[PDB]
Amino acid sequence: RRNLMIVDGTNLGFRFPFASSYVSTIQSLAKSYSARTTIVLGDKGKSVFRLEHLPEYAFFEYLKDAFELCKTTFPTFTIRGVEADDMAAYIVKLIGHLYDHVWLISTDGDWDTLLTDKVSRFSFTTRREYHLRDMYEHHNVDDVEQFISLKAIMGDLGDNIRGVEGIGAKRGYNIIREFGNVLDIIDQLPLPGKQKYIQNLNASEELLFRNLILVDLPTYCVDAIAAVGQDVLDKFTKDILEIAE
């Protein structure tokens, strides 16, 4: 009736022919989350935007059938060279105002950089719902700005994103609480401290800068979609605006 639902399609596929079960699961979620609008996203190709900044950055036929069936029921988007993460981030900032709440269907913690008091996430893996109010319980940070900065400092080895040595969630969070976000920290470099991790941090200016671009979804989502063409960005913008009426 009044919410927006965004589905991390490929991610949902990993939970499972299953095309029928896939679309039904979504129809069922749209019902339980009162979505008057549901947009299913998919991952096609590799993130052009992230690859140009980090060259080493990071069933399938049935999943294709699932997406084909999905298109006949819900607006479904797959933009080659653009991650579902960026389209989700962009959809939220563009038409999020038009809804009471936005529900993200994804088991990907990176999607929590999109959280606000009106943007939450549901995970099939844990069955948990992720609200901004519980950011500490789920990420050892108090808010989204801190989650983004900590990700930039620590990095994600799974995505081949190196981080600052010796800095974990605890040290990073305390470094963030005392000196602010990543850009604030960079501007204050070097930071006082005899500890090795502080020294490593002081020699990481460019790493922190590069990492921020790779992990700060809301800020770079528009650039990430435009990395494959302004025309493709315009068509996407036109499509989501038409959907929102």
From Swiss-Prot:
Its cofactor is Mg(2+); K(+). Mg(2+) 2 binds at residues 85, 108, 110. It comes from the Viruses. Mg(2+) 3 binds at residues 110, 156. Changing residue 170 to A: Wild-type exo- and endonuclease activities. 10 fold increase in the dissociation constant for pseudo-Y binding. Drastic increase in the dissociation constant for 5'overhangs binding. One of its GO terms (cellular component) is viral replication complex. Optimum pH is 9.3 for the exonuclease activity, 5.5 for endonuclease activity. High pH favors the exonuclease activity whereas low pH favors the endonuclease activity. Catalyzes both the 5'-exonucleolytic and structure-specific endonucleolytic hydrolysis of DNA branched nucleic acid molecules and probably plays a role in viral genome replication. Active on flap (branched duplex DNA containing a free single-stranded 5'-end), 5'overhangs and pseudo-Y structures. The substrates require a free, single-stranded 5' end, with endonucleolytic hydrolysis occurring at the junction of double- and single-stranded DNA. This function may be used for example to trim such branched molecules generated by Okazaki fragments synthesis during replication. Changing residue 15 to A: 10 fold increase in the dissociation constant for pseudo-Y binding. 3 fold increase in the dissociation constant for 5'overhangs binding. Binds divalent metal cations, probably Mg(2+). In vitro low metal concentrations selectively stimulate the endonuclease reaction. Endonuclease activity is suggested to require only the first cation, whereas exonuclease activity is suggested to require binding of both. High pH favors the exonuclease activity whereas low pH favors the endonuclease activity. Metal ions enhance substrate binding. GO terms for molecular function: 5'-3' DNA exonuclease activity; 5'-3' exonuclease activity; 5'-flap endonuclease activity; DNA binding; DNA exonuclease activity; double-stranded DNA 5'-3' DNA exonuclease activity; double-stranded DNA endonuclease activity; metal ion binding. Keywords: DNA replication, DNA-binding, Early protein, Endonuclease, Exonuclease, Hydrolase, Magnesium, Metal-binding, Nuclease, Potassium, Viral DNA replication. Changing residue 70 to S: Complete loss of inhibition by PHMB. DNA binds at residue 58. Pfam families: 5_3_exonuc, 5_3_exonuc_N. CDD domains: H3TH_T4-like, PIN_53EXO-like. Its EC number is 3.1.11.-, 3.1.11.3. This is Flap endonuclease. K(+) binds at residues 164, 167. Residues 145-218 form the 5'-3' exonuclease domain. Residues 143-179 are annotated as: DNA-binding. Induction: Expressed in the early phase of the viral replicative cycle. It catalyses: Exonucleolytic cleavage in the 5'- to 3'-direction to yield nucleoside 5'-phosphates. The gene is D15. Three alpha-helices form a helical arch which forms a hole in the protein and through which the 5' flap of the scissile ssDNA is threaded.
